[PDB]
Design a protein around this ligand. Structure first.
Ligand SMILES: CCCCCCCCCCCCCCCCCC(=O)OC[C@H](CO[C@@H]1O[C@H](CO[C@H]2O[C@H](CO)[C@H](O)[C@H](O)[C@H]2O)[C@H](O)[C@H](O)[C@H]1O)OC(=O)CCCCCCCCCCCCCCCCC
Ligand code: CLA
Ligand code: CLA
Ligand code: CLA
Ligand code: CLA
Ligand SMILES: C=Cc1c(C)c2cc3nc(c4c5[nH]c(cc6nc(cc1[nH]2)C(C)=C6CC)c(C)c5C(=O)[C@@H]4C(=O)OC)[C@@H](CCC(=O)OC/C=C(\C)CCC[C@H](C)CCC[C@H](C)CCCC(C)C)[C@@H]3C
Ligand SMILES: CCCCCCCCCCCCCCCCCC(=O)OC[C@H](CO[C@@H]1O[C@H](CO)[C@H](O)[C@H](O)[C@H]1O)OC(=O)CCCCCCCCCCCCCCCCC
Ligand SMILES: CCCCCCCCCCCCCCCC(=O)OC[C@H](CO[C@@H]1O[C@H](CS(=O)(=O)O)[C@@H](O)[C@H](O)[C@H]1O)OC(=O)CCCCCCCCCCCCCCC
Ligand SMILES: CCCCCCCCCCCCCCCC(=O)OC[C@H](COP(=O)(O)OC[C@@H](O)CO)OC(=O)CCCCCCCCCCCCCCC
Ligand SMILES: CC1=CCCC(C)(C)[C@H]1/C=C/C(C)=C/C=C/C(C)=C/C=C/C=C(C)/C=C/C=C(C)/C=C/C1=C(C)CCCC1(C)C
Ligand SMILES: CC1=CCCC(C)(C)[C@H]1/C=C/C(C)=C/C=C/C(C)=C/C=C/C=C(C)/C=C/C=C(C)/C=C/C1=C(C)CCCC1(C)C
Ligand SMILES: [Fe+2]
Lengths: 503, 38, 37, 110, 58, 30, 55, 65, 47, 341, 36, 38, 37
């Protein structure tokens, strides 16, 4: 009989039951989407949108719901924090219930198609055995996909008959779902332009519509039909797996590096924003601009928003988590309550001291304080080591500007070294660890988890592309080689390899 | 201290494939015994 | 509907059963420490 | 130590104290294990690739071999030709006994 | 506006390569039969469909 | 409590090895 | 006089568990059970490691 | 085989199984379009890779606003 | 001296094992292979 | 026939070296990758990227010469010779590490070409393509380690440099910064590689020690001829030996050879999954329970905690010279030590 | 227009005229000459 | 509010009899299909 | 040893399977609240 790893190949030559099992998989996927959305809604806390966002609570499908319009909830709250009186049906709960109902309907359809498998549609008119005209099916489905793409780009994204897409500022402070007009110039091709999405979907939809018309009207060449084995479903499977892992790699790259389709307010900061100090430079620039307008240092640091300071925190770096450190980032480093303010360290002389930021690479990084020149002035010894630049010896004092601790100055060594250790992680934040029993090791943002999962999926699907392409290109030899192979494999006595006519 | 989910994951990810394999083997042996003289 | 000609019996050897049980138990032993963390 | 993390600690301390990575004999051992993996994969691929058709499409190809059968289950000539066309013709183990002797020899020597 | 490939493309060759038996193999078979190497478990090394077909007709 | 799970997994693996050794499919000449 | 735990009952998992090698004070002296003053002393100096290794 | 209204509606779409065009068909057109697609993919890849700057195109978060 | 003669002792233990096994096989009379006419395992009952 | 048919006939001719259609991709890419590696290890320096001398011209030997990765100032740039970093200048392109990108890209395309070559030769010979599926193991290793890992990291700088001592550095760097030995996927990879070596050795010894006496000569290599319809070794004797020695033995040759194929491939793919996980710093670095136990109990020590201390020492004492772009300056007081503990 | 895009276009032209065209022309000429 | 033991009790006492019944039913159907013409 | 004459096949009806699944699920529903207490 069939081995355990070939069982589903029973529906290889049965189009009706192939449609049934594909309907079952779609039902399972839609049911997972609905159940995951409901679970996330049961877990999600919309109390603090700025310091406890969705990406700090481990939300996975909620960012994808919020990306293209679904921001309100039937509980009278929104992701942006603006209360809504009439949320409408298409809230997160409504989307989840719609996906669950769709899963049920697809399950019923799968049951019907499995039971009613023998249909005249699935049988070739010329030969009574069942068959599928794969080129025509591809043309029809390509036309369908082009129509859907054009509709999404022209109506949903542009807001003519849709809600629009999520657009944020350069630093993720004020972002919301808004319509975007298409950008047909070269400016529509950088990944950080939301208008490029609308222009892309419109143009690609039109081109796909034309391509579907062509692939419906025109039959394949005999050369390509024999070369690609177009009468075999397995070559379609192999090509689809190839395109699927191609798209998985592309989406993994866009998620990890960042794009207009991966907003910071929905998926969290990228690691390269921490590597280049993307938010730190903006914060310093704002502080310098405020200082130029006559405002004092405390006023300048008090004008810094809490969200922008929270973005400049290494605990929000997606490259600081662990493979088996499960749960949300709040489970990792506690829930953020308020910004404590920017600390400034001065020695006995009065030189300005800054603590070097911890690179995402290091699990444990030494605490080093350097002046504007770059010379090391203070450091925390390793564990119990003799020191000549200890904080208790250099007499470093810290003063906080902005936040809760605005105007407060600390002098004693323990609190100064504690604040230096907290400042080596970026902006100093206060966390509560009792509501979730947080341990203290950093977790990963949903961006990093998506990147990990889909990168591994892309690699495994490259393996699947290789296997299934080998299967469809070598179907005649699947059971084994015959007795004619030993003659053509003999060295010499054949002018062309694998050609009986030659020699 | 240790999460409920950790024990649940370990026990279920052990048992479910195990019972699947045992069911498949028992089904195959049942077919073999039914087809052969008994 | 009607009798489906594509139905095929499924067989698992005792060797295959033992290979599967060993693989599942070994994977459980390996990943239990990481799941418990 | 008789453990996993203890084994890792042993490896790290040995590398620190002795620099085993730069030792030519550990390099020979690494070559031995890598070659053993490569040769096991290659031999398995060549034997599985040239399996003589003794089975139908509805069953596993392993049932094409019967325990105690006197005939060879795979075509040595086909695998030899494939290997001698993948690389130049001269590099090929035409003798099965010599090939298996090399398979036994390489990782053991490493 | 103002030919069929006629190739199966779903066909395994499915031709069994028969191997003949010599006197040496027959002597080995007889020696193994005398020691009970053929009795005991008859379904070993055989697929479910092969064992089913051999049990259906002798 | 996790020590119980570890010991159970190890003993189960050892029992699987025991049953694979002493209750294997007996090879026969076909 | 700073022991190292390697047993499951003392806070180890499968990965971190090990049979700790014998004490450095023992060296490569033959250390069976009967050459230790007490069973606790034999366990404290890594005698089971020598037993397992030799057998 | 069951006959249905939807089955007979969609039957001509699944009627010409194995029907092929004569030798090489429209292969040069397919190759040309694939070459154009490859050039387009190279252009967009080098754009985000920053190995290609066109004009007024700033591959950066700061381009958002 | 220690490394050289330890290596020599190990490789000569290997040589002793090889030559002793082959001496036993040659004295018994199957160092060139299995006879294939009266195979020893074919006379033994299975299991 | 047409031009395409004639070119296919010529590429398929039985020559000493098979070319094929896949050769048009394999031969130039592989030749350029190998030649670029030789050029980098012979002439090209790493002084402006890593602050290191890695070339025979600078005095390095075979072990210490390497084609070092590009500078960390470059991101994940393709580093085209005509690209904005080099702007057509060969000397500046070599100085910034562009030869590493050249070798890596042309070598990835050479691996693709060799896999296609295996597919094409399997198709022409008329055998199953279980090669180019075994080679998917090495392909996944190369893709995960030399391409996916630096792409997940800051730049190409953290990819392995193409050299012996460079590879050893990469091993120790990954151990220090990721604790990759503790990674379960790496453990499965180690198990796969060691089991594949075990299978190779044990299968070779088993076949050599179960041969039929098919010759009168003491040396038994002459007793085999390729045109044999009979097996050259006794499978029954081997099965009996391993079933009464180890408790279990192979009875199917096809299953045995598929297993010898499967073990290294599965190990390599699991290790590739682990390295892909490392690419985003999503590492099984530490056990939270053990860290919490050690924090609240100074007398609690296991070999895992010692490994954590060793990794911390590796990171602290190699950061300054391994990442010169970061300008790390660590005083002796903050450098971890055993006495400092 | 930027020097980077000029370099990209020149790279496409160089890849066509130094790699694709010479190898393709040589392959076609040798294949047509040696019909065997 | 109880710990992992309660979840394990519910899930295992649900699944183990369920997989036992499913295995028995699959074995019976396998015997029926093997004995009947297929 | 040898062939055992007391070997008998075991059969479970689809009705029996559903009765068993319903009983197990209903018992789980009933006792889940008490196990969770
Ligand atoms: C098996 C089958 C394959 C067989 C082997 C094939 C081998 C041939 C191809 C190998 C090389 C492919 C090209 C890789 C180039 C690249 O990656 O180029 C990288 C660029 C992005 O560049 C990076 O972008 C980052 C983010 O920058 C952004 O954010 C910054 C924040 O400070 C700044 O604002 C900056 O201005 C802004 O651009 C950083 O700036 C980095 O320094 C910079 O290098 O992406 C891009 O070109 C395109 C991104 C789209 C995805 C395409 C690649 C997907 C592959 C996985 C990518 C990694 C994902 C994680 C893997 C684990
Ligand atoms: C009426 C149909 C419908 C609608 C309106 C939605 C709407 C939604 N779904 Mg649901 N879903 C549906 C059907 C639907 N779904 C079905 C049938 C399934 C089962 C397969 C799912 C499974 C599902 C999951 C698992 C998830 C959603 C999610 C979502 C939300 C985000 C969508 C998103 O980002 O997609 C993004 C989709 C893409 C980027 C795919 C793009 C298409 C690719 C690029 C095509 C490539 C090949 C193409 C043919 C080439 C074209 C060629 C060209 C020339 C034309 C959104 C509320 C997510 C969510 O928030 O959770 C609730 C989520 O996680 N859905
Ligand atoms: C593309 C897939 C994908 C991605 C990227 C995410 C991402 C996320 N999920 Mg979701 N999830 C998914 C699929 C996915 N999920 C599916 C399919 C389910 C249904 C089972 C869930 C159910 C789910 C729940 C119920 C929860 C999440 C949560 C989370 C978050 C943290 C997860 C974490 O720490 O991982 C930790 C992962 C691991 C510790 C192990 C991952 C698997 C590794 C690679 C090994 C597995 C193979 C190995 C051989 C198994 C051995 C088996 C052995 C015993 C035999 C994150 C946003 C949590 C959250 O914060 O949301 C609010 C949460 O509570 N997810
Ligand atoms: C769209 C994707 C797709 C589809 C439709 C198929 C379809 C098929 N494959 Mg392919 N395959 C794929 C992806 C796909 N595969 C990928 C990505 C890989 C790489 C890992 C493979 C590797 C592969 C091999 C090596 C083989 C197949 C085989 C088969 C056939 C039978 C499968 C079977 O009975 O499994 C039965 C499976 C089980 C009984 C249990 C498997 C459970 C797995 C191990 C873990 C559980 C997964 C989990 C439940 C859901 C995954 C989530 C998803 C997002 C991935 C069938 C034609 C086989 C065949 O007949 O070819 C000769 C075969 O030998 N495939
Ligand atoms: C099988 C042949 C082959 C392949 C696949 C590659 C592939 C590659 N090479 Mg290599 N190379 C080759 C042969 C090959 N090369 C040969 C023979 C030479 C010697 C002249 C070189 C010399 C070379 C150098 C010196 C460099 C590369 C580089 C590259 C990479 C960038 C390619 C690029 O963007 O160029 C752009 C140009 C093309 C892709 C040509 C395509 C032409 C199109 C398809 C025709 C249509 C043109 C259009 C109509 C006109 C507009 C890429 C991985 C670069 C790299 O990445 O190094 C780090 C690099 O610096 N190559
Ligand atoms: C480090 C170990 C290692 C090496 C060196 C290696 C090497 C090789 N194995 C090959 C084959 C294989 N490998 C296989 C299984 C395995 N191979 C393994 C491990 C290795 N395999 C493992 C673990 C397995 C088990 C799965 C199989 C099944 C095959 C084959 O079919 C094939 C063969 O015929 O071998 C008998 C050849 C591929 C030729 C090729 O791609 O075309 C030409 C070479 C190219 C394209 C590579 C050039 C570009 C490279 C990637 C980058 C440049 C590298 C520099 C030139 C050198 C740098 C040196 C420093 C790193 C020190 C080559 C000799
Ligand atoms: C039935 C089928 C499955 C049977 C059981 C299978 C068990 C083995 C697999 C288990 C995997 C998850 C184990 C988690 C253990 C745990 O402690 O969970 C604990 C966590 C939950 O974490 C908890 O969350 C709570 C709020 O929901 C609270 O915040 C708690 O404080 C927090 O601890 O469970 C998960 O996060 C599971 C997420 C799984 C998401 C998929 C993995 C990530 C994407 C990778 C996809 C694969 C990529 C390729 C890989 C190759
Ligand atoms: C065949 C399978 C055999 C399986 C068992 C083999 C022996 C296992 C090890 C037992 C052991 O370590 O016991 C430790 C004790 C001594 O412990 C010592 O005993 C001392 C007191 S006294 O000597 O026992 O009076 C005292 O120092 C202290 O209690 C303790 O250190 O040794 C014995 O007394 C064993 C004597 C009988 C052995 C039967 C075997
Ligand atoms: C004195 C003996 C001392 C050792 C006794 C135990 C060793 C034997 C173990 C048998 C079970 C292994 C095979 C199971 C599966 C099984 O029943 O295999 C049976 C199989 C024989 O199968 P056949 O060749 O008959 O299969 C024909 C095919 O058509 C079937 O698909 O044997 C092998 O394939 C080789 C086994 C390799 C050896 C694998 C060793 C794995 C060791 C794992 C140890 C884990 C320890 C964890 C500790 C916590
Ligand atoms: C039927 C029906 C008809 C009409 C009436 C009705 C009741 C309204 C309706 C029902 C509708 C309903 C109720 C529809 C709802 C249907 C549901 C609940 C579908 C659930 C799907 C869950 C999936 C696919 C999870 C898969 C997990 C995977 C793949 C593995 C994950 C992971 C693990 C743990 C293992 C390791 C890998 C990773 C990835 C780490
Ligand atoms: C003694 C010894 C002991 C042990 C055994 C042993 C190993 C066999 C032996 C060793 C013997 C030895 C020492 C053997 C060593 C032999 C050597 C040194 C061979 C060097 C070959 C150089 C090549 C192929 C470079 C080609 C340049 C190219 C392709 C240019 C590429 C270009 C680059 C740079 C990039 C830009 C574009 C272009 C222009 C394309
Ligand atoms: Fe072999």
């Amino acid at each position: 009989g069939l081995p355990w790893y070939r069982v589903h190949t029973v529906v290889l030559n049965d189009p009706g039951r192939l449609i049934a099992v594909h309907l079952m998989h779609t039902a399972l996927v839609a049911g997972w989407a609905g159940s995951m959305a409901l679970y996330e809604l049961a877990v999600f806390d919309p109390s603090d949108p700025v310091l406890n966002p969705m990406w700090r609570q481990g939300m996975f499908v909620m960012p994808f719901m919020a990306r293209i319009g679904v921001t309100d909830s039937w509980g009278g709250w929104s992701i942006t924090g603006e209360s809504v009186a009439n949320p409408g049906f298409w809230s997160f709960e409504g989307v989840a219930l719609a996906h669950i109902g769709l899963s049920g309907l697809l399950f019923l359809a799968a049951v019907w198609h499995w039971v009613y498998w023998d249909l005249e549609l699935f049988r070739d008119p010329r030969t009574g055995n069942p068959a599928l005209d794969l080129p025509k099916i591809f043309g029809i489905h390509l036309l369908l996909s082009g129509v859907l793409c054009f509709g999404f780009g022209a109506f949903h994204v542009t807001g003519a008959w849709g809600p629009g897409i999520w657009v944020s500022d350069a630093y993720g402070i004020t972002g919301k779902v808004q319509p975007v007009a298409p950008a047909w110039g070269p400016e529509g091709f950088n990944p950080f332009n939301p208008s490029g999405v609308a222009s892309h979907h419109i143009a690609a939809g039109i081109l796909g519509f034309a391509a579907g018309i062509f692939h419906i009207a025109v039959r394949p060449p005999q050369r390509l039909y024999r070369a690609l084995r177009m009468g075999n479903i397995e070559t379609v499977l192999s090509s689809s797996i190839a395109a699927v892992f191609w798209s998985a790699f592309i989406t993994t790259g866009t998620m990890w590096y960042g794009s207009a389709t991966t907003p910071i307010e929905l998926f969290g900061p990228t690691r390269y924003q921490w590597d280049s100090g993307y938010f730190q430079q903006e914060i310093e620039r704002r502080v310098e601009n405020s200082l130029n307008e006559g405002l004092s240092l405390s006023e300048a640091w008090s004008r810094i928003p809490d969200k922008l300071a929270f973005y400049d925190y290494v605990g929000n770096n997606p490259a600081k988590g662990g493979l088996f450190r499960a749960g949300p980032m709040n489970k990792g480093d506690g829930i953020a309550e308020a910004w404590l303010g920017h600390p400034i360290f001065q020695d006995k002389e009065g030189r300005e001291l800054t603590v070097r930021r911890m690179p995402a690479f290091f699990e444990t990084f030494p605490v080093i304080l350097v002046d504007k020149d770059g010379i090391i002035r203070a450091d925390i010894p390793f564990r119990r080591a003799e020191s000549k630049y200890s904080i208790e010896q250099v007499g470093v004092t810290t003063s906080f500007y902005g936040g809760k601790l605005n105007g407060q100055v600390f002098t004693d060594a323990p609190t100064v070294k504690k604040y230096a250790r907290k400042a080596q992680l970026g902006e100093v934040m206060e966390f509560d660890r009792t509501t979730l029993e947080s341990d203290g090791v950093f977790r990963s943002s949903p961006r990093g988890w998506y990147t990990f999962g889909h990168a591994n999926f892309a690699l495994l699907f490259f393996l699947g592309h290789l296997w299934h392409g080998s299967r469809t290109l070598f179907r005649d030899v699947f059971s084994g080689i015959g007795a004619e192979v030993t003659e053509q494999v003999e060295f010499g006595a054949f002018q062309k390899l694998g050609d009986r006519s030659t020699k | 201290n240790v999460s409920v989910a950790a024990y649940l994951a370990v026990l279920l990810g052990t048992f479910i494939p195990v019972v699947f394999l045992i069911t498949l083997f028992i089904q195959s042996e049942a077919r073999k015994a039914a087809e052969s003289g008994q | 509907s009607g009798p489906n000609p594509n139905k095929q019996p499924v067989e698992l050897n005792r060797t295959s059963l033992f290979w599967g049980l060993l693989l599942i138990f070994v994977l459980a032993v390996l990943f239990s420490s990481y799941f418990f963390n | 130590p008789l453990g996993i993390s203890g084994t890792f600690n042993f490896m790290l301390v040995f590398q620190a104290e002795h620099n085993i990575l730069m030792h030519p004999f550990h390099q020979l051992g690494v070559a031995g294990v890598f070659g053993g993996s490569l040769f096991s994969a290659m031999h398995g691929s060549l034997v599985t690739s040239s399996l003589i058709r003794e089975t139908t499409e509805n069953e596993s190809a392993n049932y094409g071999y019967k325990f105690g059968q006197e005939e060879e289950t795979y075509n040595i000539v086909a695998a030899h030709g494939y290997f001698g066309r993948l690389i130049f013709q001269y590099a090929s183990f035409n003798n099965s006994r010599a090939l298996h002797f090399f398979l036994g020899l390489w990782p053991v020597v490493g | 506006p103002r030919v069929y490939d006629e190739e199966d493309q779903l066909l395994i060759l499915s031709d069994i390569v028969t191997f003949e038996e010599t006197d040496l193999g027959r002597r080995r078979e007889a020696i193994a039969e005398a020691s009970g190497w053929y009795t005991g478990n008859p379904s070993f090394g055989r697929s479910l469909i092969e064992y089913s077909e051999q049990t259906r007709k002798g | 409590m996790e020590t119980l799970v570890y010991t159970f997994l190890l003993i189960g693996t050892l029992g699987v090895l025991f049953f694979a050794v002493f209750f294997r499919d007996p090879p026969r000449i076909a | 006089r700073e022991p190292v735990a390697g047993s499951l009952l003392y806070g180890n998992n499968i990965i971190t568990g090990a049979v700790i090698p014998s004490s450095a004070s023992i060296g490569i002296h033959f250390y069976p059970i009967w050459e230790a003053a007490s069973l606790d002393e034999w366990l404290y100096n890594g005698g089971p490691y020598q037993l397992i290794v030799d057998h | 085989a069951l006959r249905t209204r939807l089955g007979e509606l969609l039957r001509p779409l699944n009627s010409e199984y194995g029907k092929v065009a004569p030798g090489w068909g429209t292969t040069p057109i397919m190759g040309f379009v694939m070459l154009l697609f490859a050039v387009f993919l190279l252009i967009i890849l080098q754009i985000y890779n920053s190995s290609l700057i066109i004009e007024n195109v700033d591959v950066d978060w700061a381009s958002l606003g | 001296l220690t490394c050289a003669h330890f290596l020599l002792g190990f490789v000569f233990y290997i040589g002793h094992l090889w030559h002793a096994g082959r001496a036993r096989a040659a004295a018994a009379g199957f160092e060139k292979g299995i006879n294939r006419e009266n195979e020893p395992t074919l006379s033994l009952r299975p299991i | 026939r047409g031009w395409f048919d004639l070119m296919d006939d010529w590429l398929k001719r039985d020559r000493f070296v098979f070319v094929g259609w896949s050769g048009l991709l394999l031969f130039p890419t592989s030749y350029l990758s190998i030649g670029g590696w030789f050029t980098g290890t012979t002439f090209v320096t790493s002084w402006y990227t890593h602050g290191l001398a890695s070339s025979y011209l600078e005095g390095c030997n075979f072990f210490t010469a390497a084609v070092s990765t590009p500078a960390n100032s470059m991101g994940h740039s393709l580093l085209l010779l005509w690209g904005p970093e080099a702007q057509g200048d060969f000397t500046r392109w070599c100085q910034i590490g562009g030869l590493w990108a050249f070798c890596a890209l042309h070598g990835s395309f050479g691996l693709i070409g060799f896999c296609l070559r295996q597919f094409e030769i399997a198709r022409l010979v008329g055998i199953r393509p279980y090669n180019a599926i075994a080679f998917s193991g090495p392909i996944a290793i190369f893709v995960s380690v030399f391409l996916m890992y630096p792409l997940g990291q800051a730049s190409w700088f953290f990819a392995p440099s193409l050299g012996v001592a460079a590879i050893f550095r990469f091993l120790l760097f990954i151990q220090g910064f990721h604790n990759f030995t503790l990674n379960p996927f790496h453990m499965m990879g180690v198990a796969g590689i060691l089991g594949a070596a075990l299978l190779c050795a044990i299968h070779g010894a088993t076949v050599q020690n179960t041969i039929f006496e098919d010759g009168d000569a003491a040396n038994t290599f002459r007793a085999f001829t390729p045109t044999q319809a009979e097996e050259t070794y006794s499978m029954v004797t081997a099965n009996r030996f391993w079933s009464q020695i180890f408790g279990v033995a192979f009875s199917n040759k096809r299953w045995l050879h598929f297993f010898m194929l499967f073990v290294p491939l599965a190990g390599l793919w699991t290790s590739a999954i682990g390295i892909v996980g490392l690419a985003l710093n999503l590492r099984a670095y530490d056990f939270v329970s053990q860290e919490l136990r050690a924090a609240e109990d100074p007398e609690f020590e296991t070999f895992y905690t010692k490994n954590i201390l060793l990794n911390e020492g590796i990171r602290s004492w190699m950061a300054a010279q391994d990442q010169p772009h970061e300008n790390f300056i660590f005083p002796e007081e903050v450098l971890p030590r055993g006495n400092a503990l | 227009m930027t020097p980077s895009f000029s370099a990209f276009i020149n790279s496409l032209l160089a890849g066509l005229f130094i790699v694709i065209i010479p190898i393709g022309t040589a392959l076609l000429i040798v294949s047509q000459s040696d019909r065997l």
